[PDB]
């Protein structure tokens, strides 16, 4: 973990560097390339769907085949993925690059999350999981930030550049990620998180990607004014994801933490819908997302604890279902958004209350031994 973790985090940061990198450059490919808009729906769904199809498989052989190899193969498919996305003018290759892109995130993320769940010690494992989610978020921030930076630099460039780090992380994958030490089956124990992962990510991501739109019309934020609210939640999110390990030293379990994180987020979200002036939605917006930024490691730690082995597969189910939630969620909340502005919040409240219901059922289920 002296150098193994610092390159393992570099693999995961690199993928979300790639996912976020598409956003400021997607609406400039597909017009000068000549695309219609039904394919834009498929273009942004090919990544998610192919991530959904592969992750339960690409990560149930990773246990049997080997963690190191499937990550390294993941990067060489990651490196070639971003190369075809910026090579030349077609659509079937872009539609195939996105599918290959979903292959790379389908064999790395379940494999690497299993790997930093196998080398990390019995304690401080939640800290590494908290450290990872600090980084996947920092991938989501730096990605679109880098893509807007390489603007006058021939906008096919970010994929060459991210392709280059696909090579750089590839050599470091054989060298630095030397073979780990060495080495229930029923799916019934996996039931309660995957619906919990799906239900939240259905509603949580409904608010998240539409937060820049909900506060756009309600309190009328300037475009250089959301950025404070985005970063302020990120900083308190990042600070609390490193404060995250101390909570499990104090808290009795992870499920009890999920309930209180959800109940806390409900209370803040109720303040969020009532308050309609600038400064009492700003200061609230800093602490709206403490419940959400710090539940994603709690969910991820929940997968890695129940799965005594097959931690590639358990991380796979997280990766397939949150990608399902991040795909299904915004589409449904997009229709409900236009009847009245506050609709994604009730989805955020509703799945949060649904999240409280699900965790309470498990608590009395475990009370039944």
């Amino acid at each position, epitope marked *: 973990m002296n150098k193994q973790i610092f390159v393992l985090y570099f693999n995961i940061f690199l993928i979300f560097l790639g996912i976020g990198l598409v956003i*400021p450059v997607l609406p*400039v490919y597909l017009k000068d390339l000549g695309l219609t808009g039904s394919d834009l729906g498929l273009l942004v769904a090919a990544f998610a769907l192919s991530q959904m199809i592969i992750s339960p498989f690409g990560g149930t052989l990773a246990d049997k085949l080997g963690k190191k190899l499937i990550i390294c193969i993941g990067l060489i498919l990651f490196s070639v993925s971003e190369f075809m996305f910026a090579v030349g003018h077609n659509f079937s290759v872009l539609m195939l690059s996105r599918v290959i892109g979903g292959m790379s995130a389908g064999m790395v993320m379940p494999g690497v999350t299993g790997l930093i769940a196998d080398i990390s010690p019995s304690h401080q494992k939640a800290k590494n999981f908290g450290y990872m989610s600090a980084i996947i978020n920092s991938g989501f921030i730096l990605g679109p930030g880098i893509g807007g930076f390489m603007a006058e630099v021939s906008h096919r460039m970010p994929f060459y550049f991210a392709g280059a780090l696909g090579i750089l992380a590839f050599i470091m994958s054989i060298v630095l990620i030397h073979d780990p030490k060495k080495s229930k089956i029923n799916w019934k124990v996996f039931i309660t998180p995957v619906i919990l992962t799906l239900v939240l990510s259905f509603g949580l991501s409904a608010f998240e990607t539409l937060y820049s739109l909900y506060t756009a019309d309600k309190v009328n934020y300037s475009p250089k004014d959301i950025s404070i609210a985005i970063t302020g939640g990120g900083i308190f999110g990042a600070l609390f994801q490193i404060y995250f390990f101390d909570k499990f030293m104090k808290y009795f379990s992870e499920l009890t933490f999920i309930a209180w994180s959800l109940l806390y987020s409900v209370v803040v979200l109720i303040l969020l819908v009532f308050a309609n002036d600038y400064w009492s939605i700003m200061l609230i917006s800093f602490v709206v997302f403490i419940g959400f930024d710090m539940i994603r490691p709690a969910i991820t730690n929940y997968f890695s604890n129940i799965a005594g082995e097959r931690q590639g597969f358990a991380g796979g189910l997280n990766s397939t279902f949150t990608s399902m939630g991040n*795909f299904i969620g915004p589409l449904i909340a997009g*229709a409900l958004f236009d009847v009245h502005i506050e609709a994604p919040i009730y989805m955020a409240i509703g799945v949060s209350l649904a999240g409280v219901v699900i965790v309470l059922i498990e608590k009395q289920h475990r009370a039944k031994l």
Partner: antibody
Framework: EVQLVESGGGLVQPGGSLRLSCAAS????????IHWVRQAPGKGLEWVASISSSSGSTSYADSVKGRFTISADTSKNTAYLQMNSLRAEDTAVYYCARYSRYYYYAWRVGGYWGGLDYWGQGTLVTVFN | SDIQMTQSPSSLSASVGDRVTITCRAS??????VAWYQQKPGKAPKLLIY???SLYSGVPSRFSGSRSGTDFTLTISSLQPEDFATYYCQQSSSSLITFGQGTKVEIKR
């Protein structure tokens, strides 16, 4: 991928009730809503109605509110527009557009892309006769 | 030639390959980035730039949706003989939609 064609427009008396019809083949992977953009002869566009596909909720412009009555049927996937009590300032070419608002997760930096993607050919409505 | 969102100039003449900026001042609800439509002389209007995420404005090249102060601007880097039409802003709202009056971009000679 998706083709939507409109039909029903034609001549009418100043006060008669036309009924346009905009059939649509779909599933374009977005959140749909069939608007009814209006273009007068030699003028700019002017949105005049809107139906959401799920939980249908009409929404009319300022000067054509109440006088129109828009509705949709899931069986044939069509967005009627029951005009009522017309006037010489209602002759135009009534396109039927489509709102998509494609989404992409992006943790808080969410990628969302809207716009009226797909349009009909243009059905002409003439009111004074 | 519509109203409720003044956009300037009404009609401009720009030759082949030049760089031209067209802009529209929105209402006092400046958010939900304006989408831009193109309508050739006699067909159904097309759609150039989607409504972006209001963080992604001033995109790299050839067609820029530049979220300026309180007003939105479209800059055309180079004009082919394929891009001569009228351009319309589409500012959304809580439930309704307003279209700009429309600047027609016409060939020079």
């Amino acid at each position: 991928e998706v083709q939507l064609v409109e039909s029903g427009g034609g001549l009418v008396q100043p006060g008669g009730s036309l009924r346009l019809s905009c059939a649509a083949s779909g599933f374009t992977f977005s959140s749909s809503s069939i608007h009814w953009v209006r273009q007068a002869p030699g003028k700019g566009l002017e949105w005049v109605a809107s139906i959401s596909s799920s939980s249908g909720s009409t929404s009319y412009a300022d000067s054509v509110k109440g006088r129109f009555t828009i509705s949709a049927d899931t069986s044939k996937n069509t967005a009627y527009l029951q005009m009522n009590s017309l006037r010489a300032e209602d002759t135009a070419v009534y396109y039927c557009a489509r709102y998509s608002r494609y989404y992409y997760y992006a943790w808080r930096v969410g990628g969302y892309w809207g716009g009226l993607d797909y349009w009909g050919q243009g059905t002409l409505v003439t009111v004074f006769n | 030639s519509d109203i409720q969102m003044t956009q300037s100039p009404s009609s401009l003449s720009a030759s082949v390959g030049d760089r031209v900026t067209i802009t529209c001042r929105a209402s006092q609800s400046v958010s939900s980035a304006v989408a831009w439509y193109q309508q050739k002389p006699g067909k159904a209007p097309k759609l150039l730039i989607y409504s972006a995420s209001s963080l992604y404005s001033g995109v790299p090249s050839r067609f820029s949706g530049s979220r300026s102060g309180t007003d939105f601007t479209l800059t055309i880097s180079s004009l082919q003989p394929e891009d001569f039409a009228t351009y319309y802003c589409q500012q959304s709202s809580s439930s309704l939609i307003t279209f700009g009056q429309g600047t027609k971009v016409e060939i020079k000679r």
